[PDB]
Design a protein around this ligand. Structure first.
Ligand SMILES: Cc1nc2ccccc2c(-c2ccc3c(c2)CCCO3)c1[C@H](OC(C)(C)C)C(=O)O
Ligand SMILES: Cc1nc2ccccc2c(-c2ccc3c(c2)CCCO3)c1[C@H](OC(C)(C)C)C(=O)O
Lengths: 214, 216
């Protein structure tokens, strides 16, 4: 739901403009200084960005890079789909980054260096007492949760699909198929959507094979 | 100790050289083709690298940019540190491998440099049949994930180590030694004589924080 959704902010800068990227949840940013701003320049960055983190889609604030044919072309290479107070605050988070580049501006002669550094700052950035909650942890845990979510969901999908049929004890009629909570050789646990029940394996019936979508 | 370390190689192609930045264990790779190769140029990518993921260290027996100070300096602003022989050999093979990959990408792509960025996306995004991991890029998030949990837990051991508890045993008998609590069960104590692994009732054992003037 929340994953794979990132937000990109254009930067109008002294000298060269730059563009910054964040999964709104991750908090990570991979902003680059742009030697020249072009819909065609944008893409190469997007190409790199996609490798480090898969993004299903990115909402865009500005039509002009999206209008640029180049941009769209990359979204199809990737499979990334361009999408048509919080962001004004994220712009203020980028402003904070600008202020960060400012807090480091004196430190650095090359602005581009200051920006990447700034990125290193948002990253690995604790808030007050650290309390874990690492900005650096970003959604990286959410990535893992998603990876696991993928696995679990997979074993899950095989079960959700399957149908197991049980017959009420002392009832000629056999109850309609339902998802099964547990499998044992001696016994099995299952849940009717309406009610949840556990039954003897000898009492238990199951349908092993179905195959589609290659 | 291994996750922090990453390995970077740059191999010239058609004269122009790309900079390549793999995380060794994951094998996840980020490479930036450099318009010009300079130590300063090397560093900027390095800067980026540190932002994308922390790298404890990287090794080159000799680097021209490595010899160049600026690069090292950055490593120090990073706190990253410049420096299994068989894998290291494989790494040069990995450098070569991507080029082969690239050869296929070129008939596909308009500009080679743009083509290279794609080749890497493919390598990282590519399952490898999912054999090392369902994705090699996936292996990285995991390794990082394990570490995260490891660090908090490691810290758990640091906080735990500090606690100091003694054991009554029978009240009349004295208690021979200091104990480090393995776990706290309410109404109970989970402790370990380094020599022996044991557990006992809460009332029997009183727990005293070792600390004096901790920042907590
Ligand atoms: C110059 C150029 N002109 C274009 C004009 C119209 C539409 C697309 C492009 C692309 C392009 C964009 C995305 C992309 C790929 C190619 C190729 C596959 C990945 O997605 C490029 C490419 O150049 C940039 C990457 C700098 C934009 C290129 O040819 O290498
Ligand atoms: C031009 C330049 N010249 C140097 C000469 C000697 C030593 C360091 C530098 C640094 C530099 C490198 C790493 C770094 C910081 C600064 C500042 C702190 C973080 O690490 C830069 C920087 O520029 C490059 C990154 C392109 C090399 C800069 O913009 O200041």
């Amino acid at each position: 739901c929340s994953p794979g959704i990132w937000q990109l902010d254009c930067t109008h800068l002294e000298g060269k403009v730059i563009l910054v990227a964040v999964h709104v949840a991750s908090g990570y940013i991979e902003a680059e200084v742009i030697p020249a701003e072009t819909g065609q320049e944008t893409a190469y960055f997007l190409l790199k960005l996609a490798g480090r983190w898969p993004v299903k889609t990115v909402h865009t604030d500005n039509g002009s890079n999206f209008t640029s044919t180049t941009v769209k072309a990359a979204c199809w290479w990737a499979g990334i789909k361009q999408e048509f107070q919080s962001q004004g605050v994220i712009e203020s988070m980028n402003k904070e980054l600008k202020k960060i580049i400012g807090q480091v501006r004196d430190q650095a002669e090359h602005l581009k260096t200051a920006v990447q550094m700034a990125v290193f700052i948002h990253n690995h950035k604790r808030k007050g007492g650290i309390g874990g909650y690492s900005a650096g942890e970003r959604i990286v845990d959410i990535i893992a949760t998603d990876i696991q979510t993928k696995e679990l969901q997979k074993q899950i999908t095989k079960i959700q699909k399957f149908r197991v049929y049980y017959r009420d004890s002392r009832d000629p009629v056999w109850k309609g198929p339902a998802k099964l909570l547990w499998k044992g050789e001696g016994a099995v646990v299952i849940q009717d959507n309406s009610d949840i029940k556990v039954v003897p394996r000898r009492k238990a019936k199951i349908i092993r094979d179905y195959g589609k979508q290659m």
